[PDB]
Design a protein around this ligand. Structure first.
Ligand code: NA
Length: 331
């Protein structure tokens, strides 16, 4: 069989990653809708990772293998800690460990994630900040110095990668100096010309170390996105694809941050509209944290194809990128 010959709706479902509550929720969304990815979060019953159910669902996934993602950064964001042990925050690692030690920590934890069926970790954070530890980014950042972030997040990404986990650099083009918490409402970064010399620095080297993905956040960026969240602005994706951000143009997989529960998005757009806008803007993978909306979202995406709101080429390019980080088609 042939990737380009899949039914339109299954091509579209491959561009979605959705949070699941338990095995029954994951089993239904994968079999009924063929979503490309499921996400494990704080809302997830983790017994599915140890009782054989994730393995069973993943093995019957078709036409592409299932991607299984999680926020496993360490410190305050460590959804698998009960199973893989806790790790100090990114900031504490940078303060107490060498970069080689951080590589080893990420490698060890990556293998522990693989054992549980995880394929994608939404880490490392490459945001640069000096904010108080328990703020939106805060201690999730490896440091206030972009060169330190590059060294330490680079090591963390390399460890995950060597374990065979896809690392995802976040939150592009930089949440570290944003005006507030995008979970609760709209936020603004410093202008692009400021980001160019600071927040964007880590991406210049880290996006070229493959396999790697990037996640775009919901901040508004002056001089780039205007009043649009970055995840929903074509300018953001053009910046990443063209090399305009100061590094080589990035051709790999690009996720959005959570499109449903986060106020920066949901106060302006419902889930289906937000997913459409993201894929129009240039995301390869639209992420949100529930499965209920999937059939309505797929309905809206098919309509956008018909109306030309969404170009067939955008879908095909992103379908290829999603397939490129997975195993073979299942015919
Ligand atoms: Na696309």
């Amino acid at each position: 069989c042939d990737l380009a010959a899949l039914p339109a709706r299954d091509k579209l479902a491959q561009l979605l990653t959705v949070g699941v509550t338990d095995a029954a929720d994951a089993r239904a969304v994968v079999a009924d809708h063929h979503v490309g990815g499921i996400m494990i979060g704080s809302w997830t019953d983790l017994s599915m990772l140890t009782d054989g159910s994730l393995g069973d669902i993943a093995a019957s996934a078709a036409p592409l293998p299932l991607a299984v993602s999680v926020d496993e950064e360490g410190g305050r964001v460590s959804r698998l800690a009960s199973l893989i042990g806790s790790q100090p925050s990114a900031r504490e690692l940078a303060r107490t460990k060498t970069a080689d030690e951080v590589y080893g920590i990420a490698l060890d934890r990556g293998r522990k994630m693989r054992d549980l069926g995880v394929t994608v970790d939404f880490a490392p954070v490459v945001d640069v900040t000096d904010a108080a530890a328990d703020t939106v980014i805060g201690d999730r950042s490896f440091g206030s110095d972009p060169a330190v972030v590059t060294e330490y997040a680079g090591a963390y990404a390399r460890g995950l990668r060597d374990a065979g986990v896809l690392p995802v650099l976040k939150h592009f083009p930089g949440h570290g100096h944003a005006s507030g918490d995008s979970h609760t409402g709209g936020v603004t970064t410093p202008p692009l010309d400021v980001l160019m010399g600071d927040d964007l620095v880590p991406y210049r080297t880290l996006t070229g170390q493959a396999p790697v993905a990037v996640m775009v956040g919901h901040m508004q960026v002056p001089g780039l996105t205007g009043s649009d969240p970055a995840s929903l602005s074509p300018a953001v994706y053009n910046l990443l694809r063209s090399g305009g951000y100061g590094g080589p143009g990035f051709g790999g997989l690009v996720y959005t941050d959570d499109l449903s529960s986060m106020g920066a998005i949901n106060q302006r757009y419902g889930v289906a509209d937000a997913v459409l806008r993201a894929l129009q803007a240039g995301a390869d993978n639209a992420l949100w944290i529930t499965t209920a909306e999937v059939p309505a979202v797929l309905d809206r995406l098919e309509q956008a194809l018909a109306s030309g709101e969404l170009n067939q080429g955008a879908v095909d390019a992103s379908l290829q990128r999603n397939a490129a980080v997975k195993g073979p088609l299942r015919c």
